[PDB]
């Protein structure tokens, strides 16, 4: 009785009533409850994971001989979680000079991959020359048999995305099932960077090819970084690719799709500053990603909105 | 439980002895092709058909009545009549009953419909 309701735990007139347990009965537990055991939820935090590497790990496997031999050259290149500020010109000079002296293929290529990664972080454009000078001959040209070491490919790809470069499309294509079959070994961050670059450059077709492979190779869709999905989708103006992207959008999860919308509305919105290159206007893809989000969320009832104009009829 | 286009092509080239593909298309006027290894029980007859003895069923439809263990795949234009037929086959208790939605339309590229039903509701 009142506008303030009784709280059923603290009130003995609830607790001890006939619909609950009186204090003179024997007070044991009624039934056991196993909730967590029967059907358990997987852990997904609202906050992203604080320790994760957040980059493209380039996997440095060197024989612990050349690793010691080449140390004064390698000390200038990135080691794990450490990014020395050495100017990229110098590093490339060192590779060009000293590398023909080393005899190992595997070593020369690990070293090269480090150089590429280093040049990806500084966004120096003259590093593809290195690909055409050493690797192109035995990997990409005229159906050469040789199969490049994975780390090298990851590194070059990462470089083509960081420095936006038409070249990526040629490399990526070699990684599908009939080629090197490297695509299932890519990191989630790899996909993230790829999508973002392709999106900036604006290839709907690059975007489609990449989303198809990602899906087939079972990438982690929900953990692909939202910004990069948005920038990729934003690039899609062509009727067919557009169709593809609706049908595809159904592959994300409820949550992912909600934040695809949030992120999208921010990047053309308040957070338009957050990007190094501003987005381009897609009103169509924006509207659609919002629409999709609305379709996939639970629906709420707002009767004064729906039935605002309802009039009954006696027909 | 569903059966997709992939399963359908596979079963065209590589049939299983005790899997039956049963065509539910109702009107003979609309059916010009034959789904490979299929048999014809039109939807309209199903409730009766499934209550025949093995012999009687043989006499009425001219092929052996599937046992209740065997796989039964159902077929129609859109996948609607095949569904309703499925409910019939499931109510007599048949253990494996699969409907192939989009069935004859997807197979042959025909656009036909089992029933004329439209998505739009007439305003109340």
């Amino acid at each position: 009785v009142g506008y303030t309701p009784v709280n059923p735990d603290t009130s003995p007139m609830v607790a001890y009533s006939q619909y609950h347990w009186h204090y003179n009965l024997p007070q044991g537990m009624e039934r056991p409850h196993s909730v967590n055991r029967t059907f358990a939820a997987p852990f997904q935090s609202n906050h992203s994971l604080v320790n994760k590497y957040r980059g493209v790990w380039i996997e440095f496997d060197m024989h612990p001989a050349f690793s010691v031999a080449l140390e004064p050259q390698l000390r200038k290149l990135p080691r794990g979680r450490t990014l020395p500020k050495t100017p990229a010109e110098e590093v490339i000079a060192d590779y060009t000079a000293l590398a023909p002296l080393v005899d190992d293929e595997k070593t020369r290529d690990l070293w090269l991959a480090k150089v590429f990664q280093h040049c990806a972080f500084q966004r120096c454009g003259g590093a593809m020359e290195l690909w055409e000078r050493y690797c192109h001959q035995r990997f990409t040209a005229e159906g050469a048999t040789a199969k490049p070491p994975l780390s090298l490919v990851k590194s070059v790809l990462f470089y083509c995305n960081k420095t936006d470069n038409s070249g990526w499309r040629a490399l990526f294509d070699r990684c599908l099932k009939d080629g090197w079959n490297y695509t299932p070994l890519f990191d989630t961050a790899q996909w993230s960077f790829m999508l973002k670059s392709i999106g900036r450059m604006g290839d709907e077709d690059g975007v489609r090819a990449v989303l198809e492979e990602m899906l087939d190779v079972q990438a982690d869709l929900d953990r692909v970084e939202a910004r990069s999905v948005v920038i990729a989708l934003n690039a899609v103006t062509n009727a067919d690719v557009y169709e593809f992207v609706k049908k595809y959008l159904f592959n994300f999860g409820e949550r992912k799709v909600k934040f695809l919308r949030t992120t999208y509305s921010d990047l053309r919105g308040h957070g338009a500053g957050k990007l190094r290159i501003p987005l381009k206007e897609n009103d169509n893809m924006y509207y659609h990603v919002c629409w999709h989000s609305s379709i996939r969320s639970p629906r709420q009832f707002s009767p004064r909105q729906l039935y605002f104009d309802y009039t009954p009829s006696t027909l | 439980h569903q059966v997709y286009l992939k399963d359908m092509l596979h079963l065209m080239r590589y049939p299983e002895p005790y899997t039956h593909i049963i065509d539910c298309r109702t009107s003979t006027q609309k059916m010009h092709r034959w789904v490979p290894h299929s048999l014809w029980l039109p939807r309209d007859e199903v409730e009766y058909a499934l209550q025949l003895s093995a012999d009687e069923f043989l006499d009425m439809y001219g092929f052996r009545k599937p046992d209740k263990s065997d796989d039964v795949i159902l077929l129609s234009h859109n996948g609607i009549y095949s569904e309703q037929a499925g409910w019939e086959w499931k109510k007599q208790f048949f253990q494996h009953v699969y409907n192939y939605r989009g069935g004859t339309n997807e197979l042959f590229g025909e656009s036909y419909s089992d029933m004329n039903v439209s998505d739009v509701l007439s305003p109340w």
Partner: peptide, 21 residues
């Protein structure tokens, strides 16, 4: 709101197979 996307074209899936055979 349906249909969300354009339905698959009329393509005939049985013909190519039985033609190969």
């Amino acid at each position: 709101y349906t249909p969300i996307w354009k339905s698959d074209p009329a393509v005939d899936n049985v013909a190519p197979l039985r033609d190969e055979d």
